Amino acid sequence: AIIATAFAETVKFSGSKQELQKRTLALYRQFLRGAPTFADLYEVQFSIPTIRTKIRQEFERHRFVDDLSIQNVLYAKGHMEYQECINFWKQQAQFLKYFPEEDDIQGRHQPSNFVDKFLKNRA
């Protein structure tokens, strides 16, 4: 037969929110645990605390989503991502997509008020 691969979890939509939050916290713990493995695999310049900070931000972004089905989908995609990272399927190029802030300063002019945006036709 075709058997599942490493860190594969069968797709299951939780019927109750609480049973989903259990899995969600497990997944968060897995990501935090794997952070050093990610730092070794992908030869990152930045520190393990920064990996963990990024993970916390990612989990934070959906902290107020209510409808259960959307939470189920987000959890499934988060697990798919975890499996992608931990198995070194991803390369450094795609991994660093997650990390747009640690790249250097892109330039002198990042407009913030209406006059600087207007001068660059981005108002």
């Binding site: 250097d104 892109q106 330039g107 002019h109 990042q110 001068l119 981005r122």
Partner: protein
């Protein structure tokens, strides 16, 4: 969507009366409207500067000497952004062809040893004089001239002496040129710095590795150069780009050893013996440590009291201790 991070605004007017209108969001397919000639573009710093310039689609004219050394520069720009011109310092028409159509001219041409064809004078003073004459004759809007830190006319070192003379002749010819003096630059595959410390059989100093300078990341020098390129308020100013904190050569070697998990071999020799050795090895065809380099091994960095710095470009240099691991990673062995 992307953004023209280097440009302050959309419509621009060069000092020469050209109207430049940036098109597009600011990505590969966009065009800033500027045209720039980068002398010495295929070198260590020129490559980064060219990558930053062609990232936003300003036309980059690259004068080159060897065809095979410049090939990596074509990748950095869209079709027709990076243009290549055959050039030689003893062919005036070639220089004229290189600078003729540009709004910006920066020259990074400098050599840390002497050759059978170009001695320090020929490469730093007469070369700069010819480039600056082409600039003045074609009335180029912006001319940026890069020299070295510690550039002084009456220096012990022929390198610093010729650099100071080059600065003087540039100022005499083009009164509106901008002079930059970067500190020792490090970074990936640098020259006579970190990479040398990482794979040398032995580093031999004639002055106990005591010399102090503020090393600066090459990316930061290139970004500062770009900023100087695109703001017209830096005309006729002098810039002293240097790193945050002052280091001793021995300190850097100790940091490299700690980051390399391997001990770097240091041997101290008398100055006369090491001179004779370097003067002897100057007979081979591949670049090797100069006699004047070891002369410079007795000069510590001197920062001009009255000179614009990274702060005036709203920039903050990165730290050499922070990059260490990123900059020397392939030699750890572990």
């Amino acid at each position: 969507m992307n953004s023209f991070e280097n440009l302050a605004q959309d419509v621009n007017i060069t000092r020469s009366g050209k109207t430049l209108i940036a098109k597009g969001t600011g990505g590969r397919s966009s065009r800033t409207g500027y045209t720039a000639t980068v002398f010495g573009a295929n070198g260590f710093l020129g490559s980064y500067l060219t990558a930053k310039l062609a990232k936003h689609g300003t036309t980059v004219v690259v004068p080159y000497r060897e065809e095979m050394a410049k090939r990596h520069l074509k990748v950095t720009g869209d079709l027709g952004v990076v243009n290549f011109l055959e050039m030689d310092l003893r062919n005036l028409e070639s220089i004229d062809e290189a600078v003729r159509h540009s709004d910006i001219v920066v020259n990074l041409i400098g050599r840390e040893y002497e050759t059978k064809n170009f001695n320090y004078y020929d490469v730093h003073v007469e070369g700069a004089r010819r480039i600056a004459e082409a600039v003045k004759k074609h009335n180029i809007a912006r001319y940026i001239h890069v020299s070295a830190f510690n550039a002084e006319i009456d220096s012990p070192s022929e390198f610093n002496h010729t650099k100071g003379l080059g600065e003087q002749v540039t100022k005499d010819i083009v009164p509106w040129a901008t002079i930059v003096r970067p500190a020792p630059m490090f970074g990936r595959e640098d020259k006579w710095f970190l990479d040398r410390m990482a794979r040398s059989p032995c580093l031999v100093s004639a002055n106990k590795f005591q010399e102090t300078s503020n090393p600066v990341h090459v990316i930061d020098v290139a970004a500062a150069l770009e900023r100087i390129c695109f703001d017209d308020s830096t005309v006729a100013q002098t810039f002293e780009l240097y790193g945050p904190q002052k280091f001793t050569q021995k300190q850097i070697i100790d940091m490299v050893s700690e980051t390399l998990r391997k001990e770097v071999r240091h041997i101290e020799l008398p100055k006369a013996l090491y001179q004779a050795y370097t003067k002897a090895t100057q007979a081979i065809w591949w670049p090797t440590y100069s006699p004047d380099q070891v002369e410079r091994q007795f000069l510590s960095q001197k920062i001009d009291p009255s000179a614009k710095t990274f702060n005036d470009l709203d920039l903050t240099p990165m730290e050499l201790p922070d990059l260490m691991f990123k900059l020397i990673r392939p030699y750890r062995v572990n």
